[PDB]
Design a protein around this motif. Sequence first.
Motif, PDB file in Angstrom:
ATOM      1  N   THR G  92       0.808  -1.215   0.000  1.00  0.00           N
ATOM      2  CA  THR G  92       0.000   0.000   0.000  1.00  0.00           C
ATOM      3  C   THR G  92       0.844   1.270   0.000  1.00  0.00           C
ATOM      4  O   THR G  92       0.505   2.236  -0.691  1.00  0.00           O
ATOM      5  CB  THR G  92      -0.940   0.010   1.209  1.00  0.00           C
ATOM      6  N   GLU G  93       1.935   1.294   0.766  1.00  0.00           N
ATOM      7  CA  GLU G  93       2.762   2.488   0.883  1.00  0.00           C
ATOM      8  C   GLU G  93       4.005   2.456   0.004  1.00  0.00           C
ATOM      9  O   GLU G  93       4.557   3.520  -0.296  1.00  0.00           O
ATOM     10  CB  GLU G  93       3.189   2.696   2.342  1.00  0.00           C
ATOM     11  N   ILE G  94       4.455   1.275  -0.411  1.00  0.00           N
ATOM     12  CA  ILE G  94       5.650   1.115  -1.231  1.00  0.00           C
ATOM     13  C   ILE G  94       5.219   0.559  -2.581  1.00  0.00           C
ATOM     14  O   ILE G  94       4.419  -0.382  -2.639  1.00  0.00           O
ATOM     15  CB  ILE G  94       6.678   0.193  -0.545  1.00  0.00           C
ATOM     16  N   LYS G  95       5.731   1.151  -3.660  1.00  0.00           N
ATOM     17  CA  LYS G  95       5.366   0.723  -5.002  1.00  0.00           C
ATOM     18  C   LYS G  95       5.949  -0.655  -5.313  1.00  0.00           C
ATOM     19  O   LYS G  95       6.944  -1.090  -4.727  1.00  0.00           O
ATOM     20  CB  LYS G  95       5.831   1.746  -6.040  1.00  0.00           C
ATOM     21  N   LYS G  96       5.307  -1.338  -6.265  1.00  0.00           N
ATOM     22  CA  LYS G  96       5.598  -2.747  -6.525  1.00  0.00           C
ATOM     23  C   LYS G  96       6.932  -2.924  -7.238  1.00  0.00           C
ATOM     24  O   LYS G  96       7.612  -3.945  -7.056  1.00  0.00           O
ATOM     25  CB  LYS G  96       4.465  -3.346  -7.350  1.00  0.00           C
ATOM     26  N   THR G  97       7.304  -1.943  -8.068  1.00  0.00           N
ATOM     27  CA  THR G  97       8.604  -1.940  -8.732  1.00  0.00           C
ATOM     28  C   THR G  97       9.741  -1.911  -7.718  1.00  0.00           C
ATOM     29  O   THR G  97      10.719  -2.662  -7.838  1.00  0.00           O
ATOM     30  CB  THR G  97       8.683  -0.735  -9.674  1.00  0.00           C
ATOM     31  N   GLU G  98       9.600  -1.080  -6.682  1.00  0.00           N
ATOM     32  CA  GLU G  98      10.604  -1.016  -5.628  1.00  0.00           C
ATOM     33  C   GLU G  98      10.637  -2.295  -4.799  1.00  0.00           C
ATOM     34  O   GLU G  98      11.714  -2.711  -4.365  1.00  0.00           O
ATOM     35  CB  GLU G  98      10.346   0.203  -4.739  1.00  0.00           C
ATOM     36  N   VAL G  99       9.487  -2.952  -4.604  1.00  0.00           N
ATOM     37  CA  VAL G  99       9.455  -4.212  -3.860  1.00  0.00           C
ATOM     38  C   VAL G  99      10.176  -5.314  -4.633  1.00  0.00           C
ATOM     39  O   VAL G  99      10.979  -6.069  -4.062  1.00  0.00           O
ATOM     40  CB  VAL G  99       8.001  -4.600  -3.529  1.00  0.00           C
TER      41      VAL G  99
END
Lengths: 58, 48, 398, 396, 366, 370, 405
Positions: G92-99
């Motif tokens: 929710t708070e961190i974008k999926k690309t960064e994950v």
Amino acid sequence: ITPGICFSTASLVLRATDVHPLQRIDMGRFDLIGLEGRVSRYEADTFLPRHRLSRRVL
Amino acid sequence: FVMPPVEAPPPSLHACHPPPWLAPRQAAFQEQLASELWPRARPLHRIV
Amino acid sequence: VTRIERIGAHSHIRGLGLDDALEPRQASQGMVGQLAARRAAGVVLEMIREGKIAGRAVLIAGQPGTGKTAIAMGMAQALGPDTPFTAIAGSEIFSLEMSKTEALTQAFRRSIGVRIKEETEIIEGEVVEIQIDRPKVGKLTLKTTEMETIYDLGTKMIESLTDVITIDKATGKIQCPDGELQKRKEVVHTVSLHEIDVINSRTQGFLALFSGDTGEIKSEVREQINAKVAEWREEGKAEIIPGVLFIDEVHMLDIESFSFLNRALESDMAPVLIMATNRGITRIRGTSYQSPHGIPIDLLDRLLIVSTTPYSEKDTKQILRIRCEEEDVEMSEDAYTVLTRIGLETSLRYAIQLITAASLVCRKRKGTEVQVDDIKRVYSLFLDESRSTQYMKEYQDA
Amino acid sequence: RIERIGAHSHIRGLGLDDALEPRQASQGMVGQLAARRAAGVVLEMIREGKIAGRAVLIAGQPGTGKTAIAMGMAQALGPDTPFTAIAGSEIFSLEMSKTEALTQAFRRSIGVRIKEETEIIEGEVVEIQGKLTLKTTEMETIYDLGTKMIESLTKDKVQAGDVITIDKATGKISKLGRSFTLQKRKEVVHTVSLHEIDVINSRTQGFLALFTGEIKSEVREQINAKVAEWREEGKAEIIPGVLFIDEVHMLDIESFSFLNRALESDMAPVLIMATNRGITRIRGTSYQSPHGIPIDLLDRLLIVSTTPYSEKDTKQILRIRCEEEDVEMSEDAYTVLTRIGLETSLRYAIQLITAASLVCRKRKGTEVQVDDIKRVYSLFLDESRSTQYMKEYQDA
Amino acid sequence: TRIERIGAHSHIRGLGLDDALEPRQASQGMVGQLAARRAAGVVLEMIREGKIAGRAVLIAGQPGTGKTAIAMGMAQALTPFTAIAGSEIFSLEMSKTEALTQAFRRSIGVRIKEETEIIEGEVVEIQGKLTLKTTEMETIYAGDVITIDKLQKRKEVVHTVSLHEIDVINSRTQGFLALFSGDTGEIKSEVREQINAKVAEWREEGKAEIIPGVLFIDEVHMLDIESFSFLNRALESDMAPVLIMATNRGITRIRGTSYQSPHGIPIDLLDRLLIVSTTPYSEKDTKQILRIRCEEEDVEMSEDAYTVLTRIGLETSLRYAIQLITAASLVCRKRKGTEVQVDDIKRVYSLFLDESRSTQYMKEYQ
Amino acid sequence: TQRIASHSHVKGLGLDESGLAKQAASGLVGQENAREACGVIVELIKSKKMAGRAVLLAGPPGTGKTALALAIAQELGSKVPFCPMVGSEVYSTEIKKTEVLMENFRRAIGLRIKETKEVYEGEVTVIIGLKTAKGTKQLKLDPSIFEDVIYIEAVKRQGRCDTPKGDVHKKKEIIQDVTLHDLDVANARPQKTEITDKLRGEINKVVNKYIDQGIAELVPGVLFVDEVHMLDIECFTYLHRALESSIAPIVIFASNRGNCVIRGTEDITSPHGIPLDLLDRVMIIRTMLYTPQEMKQIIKIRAQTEGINISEEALNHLGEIGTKTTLRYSVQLLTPANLLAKINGKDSIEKEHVEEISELFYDAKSSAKI
Amino acid sequence: QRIASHSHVKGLGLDESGLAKQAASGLVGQENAREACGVIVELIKSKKMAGRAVLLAGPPGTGKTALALAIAQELGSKVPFCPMVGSEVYSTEIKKTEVLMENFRRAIGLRIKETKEVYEGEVTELTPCEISHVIIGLKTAKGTKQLKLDPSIFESLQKERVEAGDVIYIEANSGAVKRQGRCDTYATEFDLEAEEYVPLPKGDVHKKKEIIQDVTLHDLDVANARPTEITDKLRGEINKVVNKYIDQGIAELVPGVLFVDEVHMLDIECFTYLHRALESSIAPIVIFASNRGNCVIRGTEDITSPHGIPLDLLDRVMIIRTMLYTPQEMKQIIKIRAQTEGINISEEALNHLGEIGTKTTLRYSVQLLTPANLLAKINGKDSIEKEHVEEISELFYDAKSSAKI
């Protein structure tokens, strides 16, 4: 009214995990600095006290 | 003129809580007190 | 007189009736009925209390209104003290601040408990206005009804002094039975895996009692904490206890939580969780594809479905008799027959809603027995789901 | 003071008489008998100070003046009375909710008049290093200062001879003191707006009362209780205000269901709803409804329809636009301008008058030529011409 | 064993052209694609000259022509290069306008020439009077190091700084926001006007100079219409780096809307793309690039195995045949032999399969 | 006198001592079955023994269920808390969807707390001597408080001017009523999402410690929930666990439309916007249909209550225009007709006044015909 | 020992010649997939190939997670193995690309064994007599020494309570951890000092300790970013300092191995970052797992693709087939659980449980193996008979009988 809730108890196992002797670091990377060209001056300032302390001992 | 505007507060207020210790603790237990003693001059003179 | 825990809907039972040979009775510990569900609950309760395997899902389902939640309530009441029971729903993980995967692994963190045996020393006694000041230890004399003790104080204990004062081994804290003050104590304490939050961020109490934290720090909370709780394992120290998780409304949950439950049960630290399902064939959320049970095959292969049977005429009147035993106002035998006919034709919770109003009409009468005309007037004034369906022919709004 | 007159600032008030009869040549508003009659009824109902909280909707054809009647009510509403015009699109926020913004819109339009008493002494100040001497018309008196007055005079660069006001709370007033280089009761009745709910909730007052979900739970209740206590001890009364809702048909049904129950409270001001079209589906559901509004909100409100304009009323509005924008027209151009304004909208005729005045003042002439306004009208197009002349299939 | 040793299609150093910008048949780079590498050399010469702005080049073709290898060759033969994907600008804390703006403004570089006067060294006093623990000089006017800015030295420093000065002017300190992305939508007037005025004053004073950059955006088959509306002004702005779009799919419906257009683009971005199409590889070109890729991990093959490998790579994908030699080298190492055979590559083809093999065998549907 | 109150004609329910519902009593004339149904509900609230039951209201729009809930809230008075909520209030952006229905059961329940405190009324002198009209006493004062009466609980200056009688130490018993969600917000905010282990675990135990012995007193509340037919299915999921609890107070639901489509599944229809698992767990209450005699009676009672005396012909016109199109239109025809009578100077309202006002203002069905 | 759901995995059973045994470490079946995963674990252990992708194509319910666990157990503890659930990406708070990029940085790790001398503190050597020169002694159970320390360490000393009887742990980078109340402080048999009562710290002064430590780059990024990373300034600096550390001869890089489940349930923007970021030269190897077959890609609503994988992602990925079994070895697999369980079973109950396993699925019999032993323990039988398994087959129902009723 300022009521008082009793303190929630804990155990001794909780905090004493993240810690130990030493050996978990590397170096000071996040420390902004210039010294553009003085690098060899700090190199000389590290090589000289070797000979200085060897002359002090011997 | 903030005199009439701010009326009575809500009638319930709690405080903070340090959790108990029945073992070895003298490290953070004495640097947390120091890190609470660091902001005693910094929130001084806030004009409120 | 008035307490917080009042008589609710599922609070009338006081445990779950089980035996050594696992033979159910007709009326044991409040729960009446469901024999196969009783045997399945006894098997899964003995399997959890054995504590050998980990990461197993046992689903229960059936018709809505057959007392399926009360079986888990009786399991939770007869579970025993010093055991964490976590009861979550299908809507608790939906949050706009934290993720549903983080909320589900937080519930997994709440499930598994740790029993820690420690031994402390607690000093008790009455203080008699001591310690002449700075020019700074002074003295300290405590009095009992057997023997008094006279001695001096310490250095760093002057801050707490600025009435029985109970001081532990640590800095300090806040008729009386006697004994030596160097009382030694063992404190079997239960931790609901709160070892993560105490070092994950500072000011651990404001993050431990109420929420507000973000997603917990990756590569620090799942491998390091597991390795260190293995270090505290099998050395004479504390041993973990897998708790009981109970999930509601699974058949309307997203497919991503299903995919997370497909691989969360295969891990090492995976508690034995049970779940409930009411509806039958219901389309899953996220996609437009229909599927039976509301759960796809990839998760139904990882669980077991235990079906429940509806009640009969003989069990319904026994439930009515044990709820009259739980309550105070009694009824007439013809009124018991009318209430049994209502509970046979309609739902049981409708009869529960009628019997409280009948008791209040009897309190208006100021008597100790509900008559037939009283419950007849209550049934005439109060409508039902199947009764008010025919009154919707006016087409008032759409 | 240099502010350009807009499309709705061309009128000054609303036509009102002793028997409340709508006129034709009164204060720039022409025609529209029944809608201005109901507007005068609800305007007298607002200005009487009797009730507030009736939902009035204004419907009709696009271009009948559904917006200018609200500005005519707001100009004739009177000073020291709040007026707030909010559309549907303003409360669509990603930081706050719709119901919280609607409660802000409801609690913004309720004014509170609070009376206060002070003392203000005006006279010539002679400072002696110290003490002061006030030389006034009444008396010439020497005063002895205490402790905080000398401090208040030394914190500021006070020049002798200027007007220094001594209040009860000892607040200095420096008004027109550098232009060259007992007085018992001044009752001040000050008007405040009820946006101080987060002032009860939060702690800051500077950044908060100017530009934030604010503890709904029991914040409004204590404010309403202290308002009820002030209403008694006649220390504080309360006046309502007008809230105009513009184009409500672009709003979700959840805000409609919230407004259906938020209007029944005692703190609900008067609100004037705007609806343009007719059969329009509700954004959020799948069923159609009249005026873009379901049956629940339609039972709450009343509807006033606008009569379309006539020829002589259009000519009189064009005469008002002639006499307002300082544009001298010719007598042979009124028929051509009416012929243009009959087939098109009135605001397009206003833009035609403005562009013809631009070309005429580029020519630096006094009278407007018929060929000039014909060339200006031939330079631009219409909305039906934008439908017609795009038949070349320029895109897909 | 250092970090990058081999990956996807990047083994060639630089790009390979001539004085007449004609590619060879056996040289650095890839084999074939005369018009594509010629247009790449023309636009790379345009980047090296830097005359105008707003140069958007689209590359297209069949899946398997190696657009990534051409992008890496133009990157190594190039100055700040930046290659981003289609989902990096899609964030949650930032919008789809601010993130693409920060992706645009990051490729712009600034060379700064700064001359300072520094008097540094070790103390030999205290309390005011300045001398050293010198080798050279004296005359005042213990052990700590003090540096004073106006022995004495006039130092000239060359800085290669991006446009993240916009990051440091809006910030309070330079330690926090210089390590991650940063805040939300800031003052755009502070981004445009003050930055352009101060960089124009630095150009007039002759202190710093600016150089443009290259942005490679791959897989533009999926993109929301907000970016297509942003590129109407982004290509028509006052200054912008060069853009190389890579689109693989021909006809794809745009997400959020319902339209049928080539390359997933509207009419506004249609006439703004220098479109270069490719050509699939022939027999000799595939055999020659296999002869090139045999020299990657020092793997030798037999004479009768190149024909079998090219026959597999012609019907199936080319990258599968690139992976076949890696999957067969381990079996040849376990065989303890210095040369692969036909049975080895047939066994590897029997073990690992492709989409054309798995198309028929998925007829169960259980 | 505050004239703005909408539904106003209510003194109570009007129920007699013998259980019969009197018609011409307490303003609200009519709806006998709803009053006889709520006579059991008010006893359930007053007895404070059984809790956690749902009462759903149904009927056409405009039967006065809000006036019935207001009559219940005025019968209970200010002692029993009453928390109203609509279905659109639970939706927010920064606040999660499962936070308002969680905190309603905490803001509904109240607790009466009686605490004995002290006040030091010392005048002028860290050692601060508190001077009174009896004597002076010194007290050890904390280093925290540096800058007439003070606040001694766990520092108001001045108060007088001569250059305040009483003893040095005093005592007083403060009797207040604090809700449990105020306790939760004070726990979260020292001198929003509530974590479960504190809200359910520790707060209930310390409230039991206060009730534990003599001190406080637990009073349940009444949660009124309107707009349930357009509520999300996840809120229904949390509501299923909310009704399956022993610490939940009484909740009265209100439904408006006849049949709807549940927001969240958007395919299946349901009567009154409620699925079968939740509609089985409620008590169905049905309202009646209005008659024109009772319509004219309630319009006459509302007019006589507010400010207006109406002759018989205008009452007949109001009854006819309420029978035709809308009762609330006949409610809204009262005040502009009075304003027209004040303009024309008539002390009462004739047929011509309401005729001209009905000619000016339009209806909903009349607007649908146009 | 707290045995989990599956604990059969202890190896994969690969010989030197490159053949596949019939029964090795409880992994009977798929000798072709055995060789196909032997090739990729040899590719991992060879440390030369980075940027590859493995897909395990098969029907739902074959046991490819056990194959990935066998890969992880053949690699062991040297190669970091971090599996990722597909529902760990939708944050929710961190974008999926960064994950996904932080998972790729969790893959890559290093190992730079080093040293570190300990000092441990004497009792009382508070001698600030110069501030540049501080004399601190040491009194351990082995004996007493002295050391001179530069002013700092002392500036860390006055921050904490330095009194009679304390511990002073001094690290190599002036990292001081201190206690209070040690050795002996029982002067007049008085009250609490409220300290930690520890016995004598047995051990000498000068040790030379050597620890081999595996460090992931994501922990390094978290420790350096704080007092979404920039891909122009931060990770390039990390790459440069790791290059300098491995050129000086300090650290040793190991390849990164990831394993992703429910790949097809991800968004298409995760796909267009995934098959763009695996095209990098530093990309680790990621074994993807597709659960179900032909469905709709999330975000397309019309594009039909096999295994829920688009055509750009399905290419450049090795595919390993994992088909179904034969029923005549099912009673073997149950036996693999029996030696895992510790309670021996009979011969006819194995036949009935194998019949139930070949009736619908093997996992139903594997899950019913536990209540059979539970009722055998309750009723008192030392082994599992046929009556308990034929009763538990009728008491507990599967999804097919639940859909039938």
